[PDB]
Amino acid sequence: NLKDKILGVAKELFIKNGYNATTTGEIVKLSESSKGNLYYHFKTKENLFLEILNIEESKWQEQWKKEQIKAKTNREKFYLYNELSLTTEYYYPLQNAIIEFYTEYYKTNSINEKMNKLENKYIDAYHVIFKEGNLNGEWSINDVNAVSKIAANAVNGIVTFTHEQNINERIKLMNKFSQIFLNGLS
Amino acid sequence: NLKDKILGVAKELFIKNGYNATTTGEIVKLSESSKGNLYYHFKTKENLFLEILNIEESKWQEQWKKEQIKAKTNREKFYLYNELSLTTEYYYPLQNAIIEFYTEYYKTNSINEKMNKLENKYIDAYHVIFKEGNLNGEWSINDVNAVSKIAANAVNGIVTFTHEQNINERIKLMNKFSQIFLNGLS
Numbered sequence: 106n107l108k109d110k111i112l113g114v115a116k117e118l119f120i121k122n123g124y125n126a127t128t129t130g131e132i133v134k135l136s137e138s139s140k141g142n143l144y145y146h147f148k149t150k151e152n153l154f155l156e157i158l159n160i161e162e163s164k165w166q167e168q169w170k171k172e173q174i175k176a177k178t179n180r181e182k183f184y185l186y187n188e189l190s191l192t193t194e195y196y197y198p199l200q201n202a203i204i205e206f207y208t209e210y211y212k213t214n215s216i217n218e219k220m221n222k223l224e225n226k227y228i229d230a231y232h233v234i235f236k237e238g239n240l241n242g243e244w245s246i247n248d249v250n251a252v253s254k255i256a257a258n259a260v261n262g263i264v265t266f267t268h269e270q271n272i273n274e275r276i277k278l279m280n281k282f283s284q285i286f287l288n289g290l291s
Numbered sequence: 292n293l294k295d296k297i298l299g300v301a302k303e304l305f306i307k308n309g310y311n312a313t314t315t316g317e318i319v320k321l322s323e324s325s326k327g328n329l330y331y332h333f334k335t336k337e338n339l340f341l342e343i344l345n346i347e348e349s350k351w352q353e354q355w356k357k358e359q360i361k362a363k364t365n366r367e368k369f370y371l372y373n374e375l376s377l378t379t380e381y382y383y384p385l386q387n388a389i390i391e392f393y394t395e396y397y398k399t400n401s402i403n404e405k406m407n408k409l410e411n412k413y414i415d416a417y418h419v420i421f422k423e424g425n426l427n428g429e430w431s432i433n434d435v436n437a438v439s440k441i442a443a444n445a446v447n448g449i450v451t452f453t454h455e456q457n458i459n460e461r462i463k464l465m466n467k468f469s470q471i472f473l474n475g476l477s
């Protein structure tokens with residue numbers, strides 16, 4: 106459990122103080138742990154942070170696994186997933202500590218590698234919507250991996266680079282894109 | 292020069308270290324300048340940054356015009372614009388700096404007031420490529436302004452969230468996208 110308490114106190118610390126700002130001395134004392142132990146488990150603050158990101162991503166995966174019960178067809182699952190990504194980012198705290206981490210440990214192929222292994226988990230989501238949609242012939246795509254990376258990064262920049270518009274607008278652009286994209290696949 | 296040897300050091304500094312990573316002291320120091328210089332020409336530091344942005348947005352917008360003849364129809368102009376975006380040296384590079392800086396000053400108003408200013412220069416290249424396309428007959432888009440905004444960001448996502456993998460796979464990815472997209476329009 107001492108492992109988990111470290112993960113827990115860290116997530117919080119990162120939300121309240123940001124990334125570069127949180128210190129491992131803090132992490133160790135607030136988790137009533139030890140420097141030694143922390144090294145044993147994570148080796149670095151960067152990996153500590155990465156581990157968190159896996160666990161969040163694990164929750165998200167799970168979160169969505171239930172929210173999708175209200176999407177009967179895959180066309181639907183595509184529109185809904187794109188939206189949830191847009192809406193649920195507004196009020197998702199970690200988001201700042203991530204932006205702060207990514208725009209730093211970005212130039213390190215070292216971290217950037219573990220970073221991608223993770224970026225794929227968020228990409229498979231689509232991978233599946235497209236596969237299924239295929240079997241249920243909702244469309245007939247055939248390089249689901251390419252189309253999937255395209256969708257994940259398109260959606261992603263709509264989410265990221267539109268922060269200046271008021272939410273009722275962003276959610277409007279996003280649904281349109283889902284249509285134009287989905288449209289261009291048939 | 293002096294003032295043109297400052298922007299010269301900021302540009303690069305922002306691109307390397309980050310929006311934060313590079314501090315006022317940094318700039319001026321490696322800029323061989325006085326901390327006052329900044330004051331009369333470059334108001335604030337976020338100002339020196341919001342400056343290098345239009346600089347970049349123009350240099351690129353310009354380079355685009357000089358090469359956009361290679362593309363005969365507007366449908367070709369679409370692929371090409373997106374294609375070149377991946378390879379330019381202008382603007383796109385400090386796209387990270389942007390993200391960081393937007394979330395680090397979004398709780399102010401000189402943000403939307405000037406972001407949207409740079410954001411209208413940005414999505415403009417598509418405005419014309421789509422507008423003309425209507426005139427040209429290559430397609431019919433009623434919401435051009437909308438579509439421009441959407442396209443510009445999906446594309447900025449692809450250019451940005453893929454900077455690490457083989458430069459040629461990007462051009463491939465980007466082109467299957469430009470296709471899926473133009474397809475959804477007609």
Ligand SMILES: COc1ccc2cc3[n+](cc2c1OC)CCc1cc2c(cc1-3)OCO2
Nearest residue numbers: 158161162164165168193194197224227261
């Ligand atoms: C409401 O809760 C949310 C909402 C949204 C979340 C979004 C993401 N994660 C947790 C979330 C979460 O965790 C609880 C972790 C992994 C991830 C990788 C990404 C991405 C978004 C996310 O964009 C592209 O790469």
